[PDB]
Amino acid sequence: EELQKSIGHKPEPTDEEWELIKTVTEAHVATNAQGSHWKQKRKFLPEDIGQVDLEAFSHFTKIITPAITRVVDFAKKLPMFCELPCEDQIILLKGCCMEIMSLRAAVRYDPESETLTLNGEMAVTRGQLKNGGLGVVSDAIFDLGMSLSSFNLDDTEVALLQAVLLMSSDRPGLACVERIEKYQDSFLLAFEHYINYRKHHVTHFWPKLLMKVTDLRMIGACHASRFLHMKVECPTELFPPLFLEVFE
Numbered sequence: 001e002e003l004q005k006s007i008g009h010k011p012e013p014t015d016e017e018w019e020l021i022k023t024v025t026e027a028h029v030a031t032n033a034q035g036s037h038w039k040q041k042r043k044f045l046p047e048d049i050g051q052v053d054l055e056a057f058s059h060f061t062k063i064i065t066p067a068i069t070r071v072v073d074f075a076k077k078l079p080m081f082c083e084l085p086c087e088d089q090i091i092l093l094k095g096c097c098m099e100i101m102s103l104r105a106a107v108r109y110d111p112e113s114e115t116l117t118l119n120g121e122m123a124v125t126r127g128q129l130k131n132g133g134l135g136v137v138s139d140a141i142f143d144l145g146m147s148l149s150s151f152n153l154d155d156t157e158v159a160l161l162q163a164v165l166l167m168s169s170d171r172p173g174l175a176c177v178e179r180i181e182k183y184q185d186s187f188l189l190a191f192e193h194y195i196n197y198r199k200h201h202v203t204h205f206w207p208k209l210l211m212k213v214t215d216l217r218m219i220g221a222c223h224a225s226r227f228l229h230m231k232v233e234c235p236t237e238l239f240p241p242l243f244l245e246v247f248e
């Protein structure tokens with residue numbers, strides 16, 4: 001593998017890697033709430049709502065349960081994820097949930113209206129998402145989305161990104177650190193090959209793309225912190241049970 005790099009050939013996916021790519025892709029596609037048809041489908045959250053504004057908060061938490069479960073359904077469709085013990089599966093899910101959800105919203109960013117679209121249906125602006133409880137985390141996700149425009153990602157690259165986030169062998173508490181590292185590596189390798197095959201005409205695409213992983217981990221972490229700030233303001237009543245399970 002390093003030899004071909006040396007000779008300057010950019011390896012495309014092996015047949016086994018194509019199988020894994022099809023699986024992850026299909027997993028994302030089956031749980032990503034598009035469309036190909038999001039955006040003739042989105043209703044714009046009224047300009048006055050979210051002008052912590054609890055009214056805005058209520059709209060987000062109304063659809064958050066489905067958004068979260070869609071992330072769990074994704075992981076469920078990856079066999080490697082199934083080989084892991086219940087404790088790990090849960091620790092992995094709680095670790096990547098917001099990284100994956102914020103990626104999913106970021107890739108639905110629209111320059112025209114300057115809106116992200118949540119859960120495939122609700123288009124919000126930067127201010128509305130900030131004020132509905134995300135604060136600077138909203139800025140982070142909008143800046144990310146603006147930035148991902150020119151990466152021209154496809155369903156496959158978004159799915160691989162998700163699986164790479166999911167298989168983070170460094171979440172606290174994990175039993176199978178080694179096995180989870182191996183899965184991720186296998187995802188990163190398929191991913192990179194897939195990118196060589198895709199021949200994006202951006203220089204240093206792969207490293208640039210990996211920096212996005214780091215940003216999403218930051219978004220996750222900063223969200224954990226926003227979550228505390230919310231528990232103190234908004235009344236625990238307003239938080240859906242699954243929302244609480246995942247982040248507390």
Ligand SMILES: O=C(O)Cc1cc(I)c(Oc2ccc(O)c(I)c2)c(I)c1
Nearest residue numbers: 060063064067101102104105118119133
């Ligand atoms: O679009 C999807 O499937 C995923 C998705 C769903 C939602 I609701 C969302 O907004 C959030 C997220 C966390 C949070 O604490 C609050 I308040 C609002 C984002 I960003 C992404």
